[PDB]
Amino acid sequence: PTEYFLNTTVRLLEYIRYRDSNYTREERIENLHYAYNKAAHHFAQPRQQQLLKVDPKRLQASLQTIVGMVVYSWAKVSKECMADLSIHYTYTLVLDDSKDDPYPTMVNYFDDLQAGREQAHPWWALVNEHFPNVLRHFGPFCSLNLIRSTLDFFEGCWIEQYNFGGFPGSHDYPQFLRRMNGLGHCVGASLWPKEQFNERSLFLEITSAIAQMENWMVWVDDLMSFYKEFDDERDQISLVKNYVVSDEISLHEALEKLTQDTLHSSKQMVAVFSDKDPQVMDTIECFMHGYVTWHLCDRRYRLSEIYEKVKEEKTEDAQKFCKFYEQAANVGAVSPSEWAYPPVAQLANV
Amino acid sequence: MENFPTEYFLNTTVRLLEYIRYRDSNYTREERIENLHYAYNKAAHHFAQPRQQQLLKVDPKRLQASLQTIVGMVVYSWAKVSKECMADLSIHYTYTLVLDDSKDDPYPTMVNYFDDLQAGREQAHPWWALVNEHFPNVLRHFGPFCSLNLIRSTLDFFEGCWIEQYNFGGFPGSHDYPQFLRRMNGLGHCVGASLWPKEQFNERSLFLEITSAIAQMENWMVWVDDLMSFYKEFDDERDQISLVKNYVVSDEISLHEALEKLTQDTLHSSKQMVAVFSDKDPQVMDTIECFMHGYVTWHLCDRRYRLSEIYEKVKEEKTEDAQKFCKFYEQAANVGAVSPSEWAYPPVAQLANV
Ligand SMILES: [Mg+2]
Ligand SMILES: [Mg+2]
């Protein structure tokens, strides 16, 4: 519940050059609706309705969070791409929320796979069937990265169910699990649609982006999610918490290790890509600011509950905060009623 | 540093061996020879089959040498698993070793990878065709969770080799690249998960320990390998990329500063492996203890790492580290130094021709 969030954020927004996202409320609304619309229609189909066991109210919320995440972060990709990426990252978020045991449905995973038989686990059944709509936007290398990260992610959610923060002294455990379910190579490779980027011409810059972006993305999220994952921790495990349990350190030391990493990550991100192919830098830069924007506005992070508490300050922290925060709401704050409609359950009913 | 930091290398090495508790075992030479031969024999008959001979484009000699080195690594490090399991892991780890010999671009063979997988059509890249066709023989020794770890790691490894075809050590300033690449081609989760056959271990009951072992074994293994390999690669102008060489290029540091990074990490991982597992299930700590010793013994005995050069150079010297090292070395050889003629026969080529 600290206030250190200030120096961490500003240093974070000034390091990446958080000069707001790259859109106009008109354009943001344009993409949000097209994305939501196609995804909303997809999840409302009978087959998707039957195999994806999810509470409507929650699927609706999950879909809206993701479309936001995508449209706001993958700014330079086509409308179709944002939409297909929204369907995929919505499947991942729904899995992250399941409590069903993967074990029994994973017993004949390879043999069914190798044989081309529908997977026993319903989530694999749907995602794999839909996957081509995501992969059509990319070359073979980027596709491999999307496939692996999603397979890793599935193991991550498997492990994340034992709600294990690690054995004390198991120093390699924390980051092991975090990379496992961070979709780092999925996110980092989906930033390069073959339509505007050549996978062979920019192989090296793309590879480097996947390696560096994997940590920036997950770390920044863990950072923005601190004010969230504690005000109502439910036997929760998290990168920050697992550091405590495993490295045997205090919460302040933990959240400090993380913040130091995020800053170094941001620093090297600019140092390495600043002078590379301008189009690459542009996508990278839009993701960072957009990902930040999305975090500041989405309900899921309740970052609103830290506005007025510092909107009456006069320092170099609680002040350079809202100066940025506000910028977020100027384009990031958009009433759902302007794009998220009709609700999924409604299309499903018809 | 045109000269190999012998003293530094010897010191770090002994610190490693002590940290892991390197010592004698109830695993005799006669037992090793039995396993070495059994694993080789099954694998040799496999790679000698025509289909395998056609699709796997590899120089016969190099195939022979790769198999013998992998059989030695498996038999000596997976000491607690069945003879069959040793044979099958042998076939698998040889496939992955051979893939590094390929120079052919995967790009055109991966354009329809997902659609073919989903449809159950044989993969276009011939390596994937063989590896996936033979996978079940490996996977049968394990449960679902450990199997998933074997499958992911091998897929990661394929991407790892693809990336290495570019001989790229990272952009100056790309600090996250080195470890990213090393984990991609390390087979960390493959190794870590293959240590637990469902025949003598229960994933569900030992999930927390197996998972932790994977996370920790991943880094121990790759770093111990980089370390013990530091001597053979020091003067090899052919091997341009490696974890340490990339630390140099990506982090913009000196070879010594980079080498220091590896050793600090290596010893800390060793200290934590012991600290963490000594008080857990006895069987687990045993499989874990055997792998580390086995793995080390292997590095010391396979002529590939040329460590006998460091031995024969300090064999006569009163310094502490030197004597401690040779003691560990001579210790390794007594049970490790086995002539190929006692188990690696007949040659694959011969079985293939017949
Ligand atoms: Mg979860
Ligand atoms: Mg190398």
Overview of the structural elements:
It is classed as lyase. The structure is a homodimer. Chain A is globular. With 350 residues, chain A is an all-alpha fold. In chain A, α10 runs antiparallel to α13 (239-248) and α12 (203-224) packs parallel to α15 (278-297). Chain A has 17 helices and no strands. Chain A starts with a helix and ends with a helix. Chain A has a single domain (1-350), classed as Farnesyl Diphosphate Synthase (Orthogonal Bundle). Chains A and B meet through α6, α9, α10, α12 and α14 of A and α7, α8, α9, α10 and α12 of B. The structure holds magnesium ion (MG) (2 copies). Residues 233, 239, 241-242 of chain B line the site of one magnesium ion.
Report the sheet with the most strands of chain A, covering strand number, pairing sense and barrel closure: none
Distance between the termini of chain A: 46 Å
CATH fold group of chain A: Farnesyl Diphosphate Synthase
Which percent bin holds the helix content of chain A? Answer: 55-70%
Question: What's the count of strands of chain A?
Answer: 0
- How many helices of chain A? The count is 17
CATH superfamily (homologous) name of chain A? Farnesyl Diphosphate Synthase
The whole-angstrom Rg of chain A is: 20 Å
Strand content of chain A: under 5%
Please, how many domains of chain A?
A: 1
Assembly context of the chains: homodimer
Pathway (chain B): Sesquiterpene biosynthesis; trichothecene biosynthesis
Catalytic activity (chain B): (2E,6E)-farnesyl diphosphate = trichodiene + diphosphate
Enzyme class (chain B): lyase
GO molecular function, one term (chain B): metal ion binding
